[PDB]
Amino acid sequence: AVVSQHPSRVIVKSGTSVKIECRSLDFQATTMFWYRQFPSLMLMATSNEGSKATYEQGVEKDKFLINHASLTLSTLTVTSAHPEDSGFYICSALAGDTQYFGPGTRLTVL
Amino acid sequence: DNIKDLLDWYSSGSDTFTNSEVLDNSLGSMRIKNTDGSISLIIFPSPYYSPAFTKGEKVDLNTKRTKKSQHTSEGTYIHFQISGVTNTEKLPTPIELPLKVKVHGKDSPLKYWPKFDKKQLAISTLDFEIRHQLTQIHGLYRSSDKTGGYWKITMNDGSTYQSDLSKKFEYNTEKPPINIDEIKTIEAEIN
Missing domain, CATH: 3.10.20.120 (Ubiquitin-like (UB roll))
Known part of the structure; x- marks a missing residue:
């Protein structure tokens, strides 16, 4: 009962678009969540298969695209990324109301 | 509430799509093929904004979904949307x-x-x-x-x-x- 998050580490220059994948490895997922941690943990968006994600206060939809076309995968893409978007991003998923978390992705934008 | x-x-x-292609254009709707191979069934309920694009023309989509997108079989991905062409x-x-x-x-x-x-x-x-x-x-x-x-x-x-x-x-x-x-x-x- 485990979720993966690839890539675990990203370093890129201003303006690059970053993709992070969140996967259900050994179970049937429904909703996935995307968070961000400021060194605490901030919910950014909630995402069901087939629908467009819902975004929390402070998060703009086109800065943080979310795709979620199967019950097994969701992809966050921080589009045109800028230094202030640097930090730690974590995904989780519910099982078919406990969340299971991915290891996270450390992002550095320069 | x-x-x-x-x-x-x-x-x-x-959903923001660019250069999608019109497959059909009925009264009140459009059927479009997006460049990622998804199909959009888009409703246009207003007589003041009745998209007039013909088969094979290229359009842009800036639109919202009216219910959950679904897969057929084959496994074509269909989006149900409103306005925004x-x-x-x-x-x-x-x-x-x-x-x-x-x-x-x-x-x-x-x-x-x-x-x-x-x-x-x-x-x-x-x-x-x-x-x-x-x-x-x-x-x-x-x-x-x-x-x-x-x-x-x-x-x-x-x-x-x-x-x-x-x-x-x-x-x-x-x-x-x-x-x-x-x-x-x-x-x-x-x-």
């Missing part, structure tokens, strides 16, 4: 539309208000983007304090559009897409 439904609609994402003409350089926002009489600065590089946008798309700015950065629909108000567009040529933040956009009486470089001001007020 209905402030909650407005929040869910306008704080969620939208325009031509593909681009502006030479992207522009910031001139939004000013007030929350109870006070000037509220913008954050993450994006530039657009298209010539035209549906009014329904101007609605959802203006309101997205409001729900995400300025509190619209998230406290009892901030649940209604308006936005209003004003063109270089004098004409206007306005929507009421307390209610759903009026899809049934939507008017044709407009040229966004001719938007003189957009003003939005939360009350």
Whole structure:
């Protein structure tokens, strides 16, 4: 009962678009969540298969695209990324109301 | 509750597709093939905005989903959407539309208000983007304090559009897409 998050580490220059994948490895997922941690943990968006994600206060939809076309995968893409978007991003998923978390992705934008 | 439904609609994402191709164009609808191979079944309920694009022409989609996207078999991915089809003409350089926002009489600065590089946008798309700015950065629909108000567009040529933040956009009486470089001001007020 485990979720993966690839890539675990990203370093890129201003303006690059970053993709992070969140996967259900050994179970049937429904909703996935995307968070961000400021060194605490901030919910950014909630995402069901087939629908467009819902975004929390402070998060703009086109800065943080979310795709979620199967019950097994969701992809966050921080589009045109800028230094202030640097930090730690974590995904989780519910099982078919406990969340299971991915290891996270450390992002550095320069 | 209905402030909650407005929040869910306008704080969620939208589908933005470029150079999709019209497969069919009936009265009240369009059937489009997106460049990622998804099919869009889009409703157009207004007699004032009846997209006229012919089979094989290229269109842009800036639109919202009216229910959960589904897979067939084969396994074609179908999107069910409303409004938001325009031509593909681009502006030479992207522009910031001139939004000013007030929350109870006070000037509220913008954050993450994006530039657009298209010539035209549906009014329904101007609605959802203006309101997205409001729900995400300025509190619209998230406290009892901030649940209604308006936005209003004003063109270089004098004409206007306005929507009421307390209610759903009026899809049934939507008017044709407009040229966004001719938007003189957009003003939005939360009350």
